[PDB]
Amino acid sequence: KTSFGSLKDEDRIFTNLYGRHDWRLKGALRRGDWYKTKEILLKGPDWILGEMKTSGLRGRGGAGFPTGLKWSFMNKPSDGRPKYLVVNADEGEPGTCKDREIMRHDPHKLVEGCLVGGRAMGARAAYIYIRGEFYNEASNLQVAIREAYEAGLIGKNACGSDYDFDVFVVRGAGAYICGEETALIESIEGKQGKPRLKPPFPADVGVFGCPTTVANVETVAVSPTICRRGGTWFAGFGRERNSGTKLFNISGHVNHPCTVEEEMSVPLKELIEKHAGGVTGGWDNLLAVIPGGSSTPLIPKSVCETVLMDFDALVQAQTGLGTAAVIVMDRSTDIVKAIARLIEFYKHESCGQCTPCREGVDWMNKVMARFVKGDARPAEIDSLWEISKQIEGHTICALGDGAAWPVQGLIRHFRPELEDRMQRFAQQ
């Protein structure tokens, strides 16, 4: 129960995450899919949510929320309306490739996850919203749905079970904000990809004005094998409050950037040394890390050597776990240039219906470009901090928070660099 960060292929939950065996039914049916799903469905909804709550599965999207507590919000019976299971695959955050590499190379896991999660809730059908640049991945997923329908696993009698289900595939048009809980819903409904206020929560009035439970791809893809193997098996991996396996993307300034499944609460130094062989120039050359995709602040190398890859640990580290896409710097890098690029990204991808992210994101883009050039004075860094704290909680969605947190991480750990650039520009 300590220093536990590496596991074996018996427990690999995405066994074909490298396209080495197959992705169709004849080859995913051999890796342990659709085995006893009929029995799982005939068991009941309460049993699946019990497996969920016992597994301690937190949300494998950005926000880590305990499922079971989440999916149980619409266990309640029908008010003469349908119910739906929307799956989030608008993999728009930087560093994130895990939903891509499950979508291709393992779609039947996701389909079984949709079906089991719907029977855990109630759901006439599902709507797998997928990114628009993911055309071929969506085509592979549609072939998988075709194969499942033809095989007798979805439709009128899904795996027997006297439970009828459908798995639709919606296809976005190139927005990052549509990965929100409710912006996804609005774009499905056929409007601008603009979030909603929350309340009303999607579990009472959601897509088409009907209840929903949004869920990441891997959050549902890991559910049926959790029911087939048990939550205690799944809770053994990770701490008491941070549990499970986890897909890990490792990006930038390292010898072998890859996507890897690994045990939660693994140390990040183990993560980069074992997998994705050590950073360019070795540990001598590291400057900083961004464990989340881009909506999480930096690490100045003082607290990445002895810090675990978890929600609670990184929260204690004044950071956070998101999609667990690690990005790495190597002391060859204008860091202000990087965070200014991230803020340019957040500016491009802002929807614009709530004023803080509509204005302050462009404030901070201009200010950080100015810092990159160095045409400011050190009395503006505290001002930038104040703009961040204004944007933080006074927005609708969490994109303002995601555009504020990197700036905070930079000011909190690399303020002498900004000061150096300012005095350089001043003296010249």
Partner: protein, 56 residues
């Protein structure tokens, strides 16, 4: 200033105190009427940070 040095003595005597040093009329001892540009300071509350009107 133009007091011929003997009327000067007359007036300083009759009044009883030297007034050629403290004259009523201004000749060259005063500010020239064109002056260089200033640059006024700027007071507090231009702090650029930690300056919320709610606090003051």
């Amino acid at each position: 200033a133009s007091a011929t040095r003997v009327i000067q003595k007359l007036r300083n005597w009759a009044s009883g105190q030297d007034l050629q040093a403290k004259l009523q009329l201004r000749y060259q001892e005063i500010a020239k009427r064109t002056q260089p540009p200033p640059k006024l300071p700027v007071g507090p509350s231009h702090k650029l940070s930690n300056n919320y009107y709610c606090t003051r």
